């Protein structure tokens, strides 16, 4: 037998043998545009981080209500982030909790009418402005003394629903002593949270911490998970960041929190490499080893052609 072709294949002996018609196994061409997955439309956080979305960044109001999605796409060095300097505690565990949550529901657990002897509209700052005017987060509340008093707080909540909840609160790390007696009245302060399987007590810190974004003080937030028939109890004497809205979990599945920079265009995609969509059938790919959906395996070889023909 003899024919004519211009293909090549690698073997144990030689690395430049030219062979007849062969079959390709590696897949290189890709489409560089983020698109939809199996009909469900993704979530594109344009220039916001995850903390800014969950806490309600004033400059990230575009995601105040979002339908069912498939994955979360972020951008490197996001500008917005947390305006007020601080740190979310166990921030890496929360991002691991996601990629297993596929739907959210915003619920009002504590309305503004449940704070009779407490101010709620005087918690603005220049760190997070809105159209020039100062503002603050949307999903939490910064409490401040009213009529020169900060009465002790004793509130509770019972999860009557058949689903779980996510609760976000925080503490204030004041800069000097005068600031604490200005915002609040009691010098010594504490915060307590108590659930069925939780127990926590915290106190503030007063020191000098240079200058970030023009703000010297700091903040610290914490999170938890509730259960049906369970309860949560809050007690505080000041430096309290009370919540307004919580989050319901109504679906679980496979997701991915990826970082990219590609724009958005309408498509229908089945597997999303974080730099470009791919739709192929041959069992090996080379683009990037972090995929969502159903993609072939990842190898670093630059050429993986296996011959089928003779000579």
């Amino acid at each position: 037998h003899a024919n004519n072709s211009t293909e090549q294949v690698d073997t144990i002996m030689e690395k430049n043998v030219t062979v007849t018609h062969a079959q390709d196994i590696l897949e290189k061409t890709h489409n560089g545009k983020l698109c939809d997955l199996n009909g469900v439309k993704p979530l594109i956080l344009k220039d916001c981080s995850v903390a800014g979305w969950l806490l309600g960044n004033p400059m990230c109001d575009e995601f105040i209500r979002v339908p069912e999605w498939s994955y979360i796409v972020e951008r490197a060095n996001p500008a917005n982030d947390l305006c007020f300097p601080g740190s979310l505690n166990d921030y890496e565990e929360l991002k691991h909790m996601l990629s297993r949550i596929n739907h959210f529901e915003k619920i009002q657990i504590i309305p503004k009418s449940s704070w009779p002897n407490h101010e709620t509209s005087l918690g603005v700052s220049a760190a997070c402005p809105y159209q020039g005017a100062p503002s603050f987060f949307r999903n939490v509340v910064w409490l401040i003394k009213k009529n020169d008093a900060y009465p002790t707080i004793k509130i509770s909540y019972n999860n009557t629903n058949r689903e779980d909840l996510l609760i976000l609160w925080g503490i204030h790390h004041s800069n000097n002593a005068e600031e604490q007696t200005n915002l609040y009245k009691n010098p010594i302060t504490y915060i307590s949270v108590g659930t069925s399987t939780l127990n926590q007590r915290l106190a503030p810190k007063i020191a000098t911490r240079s200058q970030v974004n023009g703000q010297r003080g700091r903040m610290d937030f914490f999170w938890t998970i509730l259960k049906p028939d369970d309860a949560i109890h809050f007690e505080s004497n000041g430096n309290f960041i009370a919540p307004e809205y919580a989050y319901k979990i109504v679906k679980k599945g496979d997701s991915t929190i990826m970082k990219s920079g590609v724009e958005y265009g309408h498509c229908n995609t089945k597997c999303q490499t974080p730099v470009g969509a791919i739709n192929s059938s041959m069992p090996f790919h080379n683009i990037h080893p972090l995929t969502i959906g159903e993609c072939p395996k990842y190898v670093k070889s630059n050429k993986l052609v296996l011959a089928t023909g003779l000579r």
Partner: antibody
Amino acid sequence: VQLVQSGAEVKKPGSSVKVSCKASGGTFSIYTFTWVRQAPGHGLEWMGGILPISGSAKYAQKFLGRVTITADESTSTVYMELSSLRSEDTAIYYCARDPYSNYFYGLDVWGQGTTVTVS
Amino acid sequence: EIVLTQSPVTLSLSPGERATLSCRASQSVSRFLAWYQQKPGQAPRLLFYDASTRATGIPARFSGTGSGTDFTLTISGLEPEDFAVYYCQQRSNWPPEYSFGQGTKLEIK
């Protein structure tokens, strides 16, 4: 969610009418609300509205100084205040609702409307 | 702002044949175009949305494609309940401003 409107009234041109868009049955503070005006021979028009959690308004570049829209998030109602009526603006007005924020599906629930008389 | 012009107001129609509408964009609208059908007397009613997607309640009789420069809405079989006026809509960037078309009429031939 039902969006029955206020009612009907008659007033001569030049004045202002406070047409209300009452609703109930959910969280009113994260929803999009707008207005559609219908003079007799004027098809479909638009003014703008308010998202009740921010506290601003995106008015209409056609008449950016015409109307004033505000919302109260403790009673699930929206307002509108157009001033200096003419003989042109005489017929009914409508209110609507649009769900979600990062995407546009459509104005789903509409209502029945409010009728006015100008002469 | 964005201005839209539709196919012409008068279009006689009789059962048995098929009718199709259209309204044209001016600068650019990606996929933000909804539909309404207003029978005389009552409030505006919803129809196909997203310029291509279906919705609950509307029967399978009505259809239409689009998502581009050309927008369409194609019927399959005429019914004695398909006489009203139909319109167009679009939505702007994050500060949301709207605009409506002039409307198209339909009457029995």
